[PDB]
Structures are given as structure tokens and as C-alpha cells.
């Protein structure tokens, strides 16, 4: 035991390893693995065929639009004008309140990233018999603000970059959309649910019919045209942020309308029960926990002067169980700085107590204390299912 | 074919490659795997004691899979605002794009601060996930099977909340499979049920019921990331998305 | 080039594809689409018992589905969500005769477990003046994925690699389908750990990308037929055929 | 021209160079960049819960820029004495001298001691600063957009207040720009708004509302320094100064 008298290192604690970092950085762990040198392995038939990469995903077409193309489209006719950003779109005509959308793989892999740049590629499969013949422009106009999105026609389109194509025998091509913008990268068209900071697209694609289709009588008047999107050779994305897209695995959504009334967050589930600071434990009040001084707090009801209010739950199944389900309540300040909720037998007693408390009365008053539910009614004391909504009954005083 | 390109109509003069931000920000974002390892919120809960728990009872148990837990908006009265609003995430969004996976996960559970009590964490490779329903965090009730209690053989670890209240993990790949399912799972084969979750982690406090009252309705957020060894396999196209900025406003 | 000279023979060359004792022809180049790299044999890890591919009979081409594709079918309209190892058996049994009758499928009657690459050709005979386009897409273990009912649409299969069958060209769609499943072998009957979802690798499905279009007095129907080779297979676990149960009706 | 010198009328015999204190104090002060990295007070606040916050809600959000936040003396009744008295600082004073910048920042937020609760910190490169007004720390109210909540993709970090209550940061340069604006900003172009802040950091406690009462009106001071990689560009002369010792006395 030589003594080690020299001064100790002086380090600063932190509670946690970095969450953001994810590359050139060893990240220590409490492995639940047995061997400490063990690591997952891939037997030769279990080998990972797919090299996950933004480019390996971006370089896959997904059908994104399906133009119809009738014979009687005159030479000027528009077929589509989808924006020249990866977030090209095809809404599903669903019954859902919040409609789902198809995306190109580039349109999903690029939603995860704040910024993108480089060429896109729209393959066009002009589905036709070789006996169909026609010609169509597939132009690209840099710098079109949405007000200029209209006023377009194929002839203004010809002024800027475009590509004529001749449907005859070969019936497919692949226009490669240019990246023209003043910004070296380009910001996401959408965003995490936050409308400002949603820049619109750099430029717009167009596809007018330069020479109208001229079918034989024995073949169809109409030709389908599929528009596929693919990340180009130079397509690339940088900053990772919140995806602007969510999976359809669960399309439930919950509006936070303030009109319905409910206990403050973290104070539910609650059950009727005794509490020593209120009526000396003689009378019921909601509680979010068995321990002392754990009464549920409640939002202050907005009562205009000269009126009164008392609660009634929308669903009697979710009310906390006493001797009877507690569908009725009167919310009043406890004098401890928070609004306790006082369960009552019925809408009538609740209305009466409400008449008292807004009537210049107080909790200590005998006329009120008669209206409070006695402790013996506590019963099993089952908790309310979650944090159930309370409709606010209102009456003139 | 899908990736065929019949006749390119090039207009572009060649654009400078940026190396995915390597030439600007100093860091490539090319490999999507290295982004997969940024940590993500995985689940979230308010602890809810029901039965008078002993030292051994697990407080909650959740299956541990890359796909992400079935999304839990929460009850209409008390939404978990992030999943309600910031739908799903990144890692599940990319897990959407492939059909099989074979790899580790990491977790880094963040326990509530006010509590002092010790916390154990089992991993349970044995357990089968039983359909996409009940692929969610579960608040275990009264003990009736071995599911509700600490178990001897299963790999485990015990954070001391007093020293640092965020146990960090490395759930390993233990399955008798080539590689597990990765989309949502409805369980066709009875033996398909072993083919999804890496295991079935269980967190549990060692508090006696007298002290367990401090713990009630204290948040316990959870994180996860795919753990380096992860390797998704077969490509599968994205199911329809739902744009987030288009979600309804709260309305005043 | 550009010098047609049709004779009694007709004009073009006819490429073939012999296997065991079944040759079948396509005038057109197949639109091959291969979802995965070729599988490793994997009998090594899970079978002491005698293993043997039956190359001389399992690898023969044999029909599993055929269907009319009239102009009445709307844009996105499934024609056939074939399962594959099952449809090879389910179609035979649907045709009112036992699996034992058909040479391709006798080893399934016996061996408890199957593995191996598949081949699927989706031949068509649309007339040259018709306009339309099938896609043929293989989707691994579709049934396991409950949200597939939403994905199962042409926008959603066009993202993964898939064959295209233009009705103008009457193109034939080859489709190699190497084995990939969570478990290395597919059982051919009820087995101790699973029963339901028997012998179900996944599903071929042939959504329409463009409905047939034609002159009002033109040829309405367009028949399609789907052959399936079962090549680099291997069977293991010999077992009595009385245990075998007829495949789920689908 | 500005730096021209037509005809020097030297009287001086040469003075010994000191190397900017290198010859005395042992350290050069020549490079102003290395002084820029001494940390400075950046903002300051008393936490103010309004709505009944959930685990996910951000407690406050501020844009993160070298220019310094718009100076906040505070209300006439309750001045923040340092900004009232010690006007601005060093780093903003030198940020006054240049017109563009391109670099990192560091922060080292100092949370209140009495609170135990875990604390997360988002960085949000997406957000545009919207004029010099509302370039200040903001106490977010009820959730209505995604602005008010934790988000999945955005880079983040989670200090455990119990272990050490000062998360330290490295806000990086993520903009699709050559280099950002550096003086005060009134937003001419709509796309000029992406050209200022590095991002828009958001700090948020994970406390349930029952515990959030401990947190109210507890100070949270913030620091910043330019982070080594910073490089201001075009020279621009100083706007008029206001001498500090000449500021009025409190008057007894
Ligand atoms: O707190 C300290 C720091 C350094 N050192 C010693 O100083 C020396 C230089 O440390 P570094 O690795 O540069 C080395 O011998 C250390 O052990 C201490 O003993 N205590």
C-alpha cells in the first residue's frame, strides 16, 4: 500500500449520453446480452441484401400520378402541373376525416429531412398501342410562385426548359427534372404540424399536349399516362428533422377543444374519497391517490357573474364508482389554491350547492355541508376510467 | 420493371455533388442507418399502481421491437400530445419501408426524478407478441403468472435511481429465426408470434407499498434506436402517409 | 434491321424455356423482376433427416391460375392475389382432385417441410391493338401484415420491384421468387408449433395499372395464365401422407 | 479610401511590442475570436406555467443566434438588472461589427437547483426567425401546433437535473445558405427569414402538473459562445454606442 497522495482528476458529471449523435462515437451500454464481446451475427443465408441508404430508397420509382389522355384534347390542353419537389402527391378518396396520401419513395424518405437538392426524374409510361401516335411537351419552369402557377400555357412553357416527346413506337420516357433555385439546398414543402416554415416548391413541372393524339378507329380514343417519380442521380438530402408524414397504422387523432371539462393532466385516474382538510373527512371529494394530500385538482370553470355551473359526465360508465356511480359534481376552490371537485348524489343537489357557493356561501356553511356526500358512501372506491370528459351544466342564479 | 429507365431525356448540365452535406455541414446523411441510431421517443406513461405491490412485482412490461409500439394517442380526454401531433416518428417510418429485420435495440429509459427507489429491468426473450393489439406498454396487475414478477434466469439490470435515473440498455437479438417481421403484425401462424418482438422488457420498482405512493402518476418516458447491428432486409413500398401540417387546429 | 420478311413461318424468333419435360414459349422478352438475391440451401441448420430436391418433377412448369381480364375491370382492380406455394396446391385441389395426382406436387404429400426458390411466369395473349397494363408484384408474407389491406393498391406495389405486363405488347412477365421467410422452412401440413397460415410464403398479386381500352367493336376479353416453376427447392422430414390436409379453400 | 495613409508624420521612437500581454500576463489577446469563446449571458427568465402542461410540452423556446437575443430589460417594475445595467455584452458587441456569419454556437443552460425533474432540449433547424420582434425567449402556451411539443426527428438531448443541472450544447450550422445575417433583422425577403437563426432551441420539463408547481418562477439562465467554427465575414462599422458609466443613478 503505497499511498497515492497526488491530486485527483476533476471531472464534471452529466446524467446521460448524447441522444443526437449517431456515428463516429462509441456508445457505452448496460448490455442485457450474456457475453460482453457478443454481437448479433448474420448466418450466410440471413445476410442483409438491402443496403439501407437515402439514395437506395430515393432511386426507386413509385407511381405518383395517372393522367388520362383523350383524343379530343386540343393542342393546348394541360394534363398535369405537379410541383418539382419530391413531395409529389396522390390523395386517396377515403372516408377518413384526415385523408391519407400516397407518396413516391423519394417523397417519404425526403420528408424526414429539412432540406433537399438535385434532380428528380419523372418517368412517363405513355400506355399505348404502337398504332397510337401523338406528341407532348414535358416542361419545367423555374421560379413560379403560386400566383404565376396560373397564366401558364404550353407556349409560355416553351420559353424555358422543356422536352418534346413523340409517342409512336417507343411509348415511354424519363424526363429528368433540373434543380434550379437560388438556394444551394431547398427547404421541406411541409413540416411537423406547424404551418409557418412550409416553403412551397422551387419550380413547377408541366405536361401539355404539343400534338394531339391521333388514334386509328380500331384502337381506343383514350391513352393512360403513368407518372412515376424517382430521386435523380444527384438527389440528396441533409438535415434530419421531424417527418412531415405519419404512418396509416393508426389514423386516430384527438382535437383539444376546450369546451369540454376535465381534471388537470396528471391528476387522473381519480376516485371518490375522504380527505382531512375538507369537512374533517366527513364528506367525499375526488382523489388521484391513496396517500394524504393527493386531491385531484380541477380547472376553474368560466362562470359569468349572475350564473352558476355544475358538472355532469358524458358517460356514466367512466365515472368513479362509489355506492353509486358519480355522474355529478361541484367544482369549488379548496382554499389551498386549487379547485377541488365535490361529488354529489344528483343534478339537483349539485344545482343547490352551486346556488349556494355562487350565492355568497362557503364550504364551511351548514347549508352546504348538508349537501356534501357523507364518507360512508365511498364504497369500493374504484378509479374513474382514464380522465373522463365532464359536460358543464349551466344555470342562471 | 420498377427501376428500369427506358430513354432518359437529359436537360441538366451536371450539378456539383455535395456528398449529402459533407461539403457543407461536414457530415454525410447518405446512410440512413446512421440516422436510425439517433434516439427516438418509444413510449410514454403515467405510472398507475393498482394492486398493493410487493418488492418483486413488475410495474410495467412492454414488448421491444424496431417497428415501434402501436401508436398510443391516449384517451380523448388526455392525449399524449406528441404521438397525437408528432405522429409516429423516424425509425418506425423507415421500419415501414422494409419487411424483415435482424438486430439489436437500445433503450435508455428515463425514470421520474422525485422517486428514489431502485429499479430493475428484465429482458424476456421467451415471450411471444400476441397480435398487434397488446403490442403496447402494459401496467401489470395482480400476480397470477410469472409474468408479473422478477425472474431468475432472464437477463436483467438494476439502476439506482439515486445515482442516475436513466438506465441504458442493449436488447439483443434472441430468436430462433432467420429474421423477424417488421411491418404491423396480425399473427397468422402461432409460431409467427415469436417472429416479431426481440423480447418483452419489464421494468419494476422495488418499493414497498408504503413508498409506492410517491411513484404514482410520475412519468416514465422511453427511448430507442436500432443499435448498430440492425439490418433491415426486403424492400417494401410505403403504405399511405398522412401529412402532418394538414392536421386540424385545436380551435379557440 | 428494319427489313421484315414474313414467310409461312411468320416473322420473329421464338425463345424457349425447357425444364424437366415441359417446354414453353414466349415470342416476347420477359419483363423479369427479382425481389431478392438467390437463397442459400439451409438444410444444414435444421434437418438431420434425409433431404432431397426432386429436380426431375418439382421443377416442371405447372399452371396455377388463369383469368379473363375484360375492359369492365376498373383501374385499380385485383385480378388475382395468388399465394404461391399454396396456390400450386390449392388450385389443384380446387380443380377437384388430390395433390397426389399431380407430379409437381407429390413430394408435398409426404415431406413435412419445404424450402426453395420459385419461378413464376404470367403469360398473356392480348391482341396488339389493345391498350392496358397489368403489374405483377410479389409481396413476402403478406398475411402477417395486417395493414396490407391499405397498401394493396397499384400505387403501393409499384414502389417495390414488380413485373409489368403491357397488353399492347402482350408481354410475358417472368418473376423469380427466392425463398425468404422468418423461418427457413415452410411446413406442408399442420405442425406442432403452427397450424394456420400453412405453407404461405407470401403473395403474388396482379393489380391493374391501366384498364383495357379498345374500339367499341374490338376484342373485349384478354385472358391470362400463370405458370410456376419450383426450382432450387429442397424437402425435409419424411412423413406419412395421411397426415396431410387439403389446403385452405382461399 | 478608408485605410489609406497619405503622409505619416512620425514622432515616435519605436515602442516595444508586448505581443498583447504575452510578454506580461502570459497570454495573447490579439485574436478576438478566442475572446468570443468566453461564455456570455444570453437570456434569462422566470419560469411561468400557464396551461396545465403534460410531459411533452416545451416549457420555453428561443431562437439561437450569435447576434444575441433582442435585449430584454424586462418590465419597468421588474427589470432584469444585468441587461438594464450591463447593456448587451461582448459577443453581440462584436457581432455588431460584421454583416455575415457562418458557424456553431454553444449554450450550457443553467437550470434551477430546487427542481429534480428531467429536462429535454430540442434543436429545430427548420424554424424561421420572423423579424427582430419575437427574437426572444418565448413561454409557450397551450399546444396548437407542433411547436409546443417534443418532436421525433429533431436533434435533442435530455439532462437529468438530479445528476447535474446544466446541460451543455453545440448548436450546429444547418442552413441552406452561404452565410447568415448578423446585424438586427427586419425580414425583407420571406426566404430571408431562414437566413438568421441557427435554429430554434426548445427546453421543456417532463414534469406532470402536480410537480410543475415547484418549478414556477425558478430562474433559468442561459449562456452562449461562438463555438470555434464560427467565422464572421464582411466588415461593417459600429452603430452608435451608448456609454455605460453615463447611465442614470437610481436616486435615493
Ligand atoms: O488533476 C490532475 C491532472 C493531471 N495530473 C497529472 O498531470 C499529468 C498530465 O496530465 P494530462 O494527461 O496532460 C499526468 O501525470 C497526470 O496524471 C494529475 O495528477 N492530476
TrEMBL record, chain A:
Q: Where in the cell is it found?
A: Virion
Q: What is this protein called?
A: Genome polyprotein
* Species of origin: Deformed wing virus (DWV)
Automatic annotation (TrEMBL), chains B, D:
Q: Which residues of the full protein are shown?
A: 903 to 1154 of 2893
Q: Where is the signal peptide?
A: none
Localization per record: Virion
**Name listed for the protein in its UniProt record:** Genome polyprotein
Origin superkingdom: Viruses
UniProtKB/TrEMBL annotation, chain C:
Cellular localization per UniProt: Virion
Where is the region Disordered? Answer: 1-15
- Its transmembrane ranges are none
UniProt organism field: Deformed wing virus
Tell me what this protein is called: Genome polyprotein
